[PDB]
Structures are given as C-alpha cells and as structure tokens.
Amino acid sequence: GMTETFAFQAEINQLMSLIINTFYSNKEIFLRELISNSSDACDKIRYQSLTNQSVLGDEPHLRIRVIPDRVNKTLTVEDSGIGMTKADLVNNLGTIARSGTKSFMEALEAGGDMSMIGQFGVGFYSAYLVADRVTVVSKNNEDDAYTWESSAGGTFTVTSTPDCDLKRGTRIVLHLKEDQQEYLEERRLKDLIKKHSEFIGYDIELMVE
Template structure:
C-alpha cells in the first residue's frame, strides 16, 4: 500500500534553493548520484568482510542508462540497498548522512572509502529533474521499496518488485535540461567526474560481454611508486591532462602522516608565460573528482 509523507527539512522554501543553488555546476549531480552508489557498494563489501552479509558473485559496478523516449536518466548500483525504514531516515531527512551513520557503527572496522553525505547529494538530482524515483532492495530479508517525489517537499513510498540487491535511481529529466538525455554528454561527464572511482562505471550497459567501463579503478597515483615505470607516468599524464607533450619531470606523492595524501605532481613543458599561469591541480577525495581549479594548493 502506498504511503505518503513530508520530506523533513526546516522549511518548505528550502527545496527550491536546493534545486537551484546546491552546487555551482548542475552537471555535478551525476557525480553525487554515482558517488552514493560507490558508497553503497563499499558499505556492502565491508559487511561481507565482517561476516554480516554474503556475496552473490556478481561484479560490483555502477550502470547508467539514458531513455530519450521516456526522458529518464537512470543510475543503478548493486550495493547495500535500503529498507523502508532506511529510506525514511536517509532520503526524507535532508542532509542526514548515511555514510556518517554507517561509519559511527562500524568505525572499528575502518571507515576508509566511504565518501560522504547522502542526504544533500541525492537531492542534487532535482537540479535537472522534475521527478525522481528510487527502487531499492536491501541485503536484509525485507521487501523492496519504491520512493518517489517531484521535489516539492512531499513524497510517496510503497513496495515494489525489485528482486536484486541494490538501488536504482530514475531521474525524470526536466524539459529545459535535455542535454542530460544525450548519452555522449553523459559519457563525457562520467569521464570528468568519475574517471578514478573504485568500481567500474558503465554507460549504456548491454551485458553482451563487450561492455567497457569508462573509468580506471586503480589510477596510477594509488600505486606504490616503485611499481610504476616512466612510461606509466607519461601515459597517465597524457590521458589525464590531454597534453601530448611529455612533462619535464614528476613527483609521486605517497604519504600517510600527518594526513593521507596520494598524488602525482607533474611539471609540464611550457612555451610562454600564459601557459605557466594556467597551471592547476586536479583534486580527488576517495577517488572522486572534486575540482581542477584549486590554485591555493
């Protein structure tokens, strides 16, 4: 039976603000939704490692699909999934962090790899969507859940027939945001924001054995410097910065005290002062792209 309720925010006037001003770039919504899927998979893997859940042998991955006729963009993971109680807790309470709650419970098992705040990140979908649906099945033996809201501070929730563990988010793209129904554009956004995420990310997955992920789950900067060759560094530079001139040299950063930092600092060949001033740092957190204009670093 369908249940209805109000999204728990401090004021109904907050929802238009979230939809329009949550992030400076609208396309960041895709990073947020995919990052939530990555978190869900990481949580499930931790439960498996602790003996609290059982693997099914499938590939951990994120699948993104576009349906132009239905005007939908769908992101699906095979992570931990949610019960109805968890949907109420993590979705209807904006800014409540499912990641923080999970870490508080399992911090002794190590919290590395959990990315962030599910509440606000999920609602970034409304920057480009007129309606959003969630279909989710928990790893627990409980009914699958369907949640839906048009972003006006109300929602409905009922059971659904989803059989496989994980969460599927279906975004009904608004009329003025049709660029997000272009599969080639979605692929470009995945390469920009999700290129180093720790699980394979597919766009237009067909399941015919020929599907190729758009990301690299083990970027060079995560490896031990002694295991990297000069050619590895040069190729990573070309692929990451789209510069086919070889860098002058590079420094591989690999430290865990007083904070954890991994990266590669490249010194490119520059032909003029303008190119020198254009130098920048690409910043990632838990392999999720944050920004490429951090001049203060």
C-alpha cells in the first residue's frame, strides 16, 4: 500500500541521529516531556473553549492517559488536547522548532545535558531515547485524523486514518527498545509520574488494570 514518506529537515535529521543508540543516565525524562506536551495541548483547547465552546465538540473532557501494552511491548501517551493537522505533522512544527533544534544541537556538541531538551522546545524527540519506532495518531478540529511514524533513519511517514477512535487529540505510541522494557511496569510508571510529573494540572491517568 502506498505510504507518503518525507525526509526530515536538516537540523531535525541531525538531532534524531544524535539521540538514537546513545548511552544516557536519565532516559526516564522522556515521560515528563510527553506529559508536558499533552498538558500544553489540553491548555490550548481549554483556552480556545473560553471564547468558542463549540471547539470542544463531542469531546468536552481534557485528559492525559498513560497506557503500557505488556503484549505489544509499547507505551502509549494519549491526550484529548488540541491535536495536530497534516500540515503540522509534515512542516509547521519543524518550522517553529527549527531555531531551537539547531541551538540544542550546538549545546549537545558542547557537552550539554540531554535533560534540558524541553527548554529548547523539542522534548518530543526524547521518546527516541527509549523507543526504536514512534507512531503518532492525531486529530485536530481543522483536519482529518492522520498517522505520523518514524524509526529515526532520516524519514517519516504520514497516512490518513479515517477510522481511528480519537474525536480530538494525540496518541503517541512508543515501541520500546529491547533494554527499555522497564517503562511497561506499573511501579516504575507510578514512581516516574510521581517523580517528575506530580503537579501537572490534569490527572495523569495510568491504566493499571
């Protein structure tokens, strides 16, 4: 089946090349980065709803949910936030992140700590510290539902998903690397949500059973 595939922009391509298959002592920070993004997406739609309540549509509840899949060996971070359009997935996010991507790359070449990735506005990419593939399913009010996917080899796919569960928001599926399986464990995820994301202004829903 024909899948639309794109080459990442120079700076992102170089940043992902840096992140993958590298030792780091605090790879657990990926969770804080994805939850903060989800909190921000929820805040954007909450803000839009203050002027136009119709923006909430059939999904009036704002949540952040963490789903470990012990059979598929995946960790999912899903929210009912603003979501992303096709143009966001393909170009717009990379355009706004460009300067910060180049600046973080420069900090990393200088011995910079990977934990400050979020201050550079490219925190999503920390998912590649623990995953070898990331699938991103997103539905924004202004577009159809789309699936973005990448194994950080320089390319990414973008496919329309006109049959996904999502009324609005983003679902990030982390296909965990063989040695990063600890992020599927209930205690680890509880301790991790508590350690770095305790006072997030939305419940961090952890699928326990």
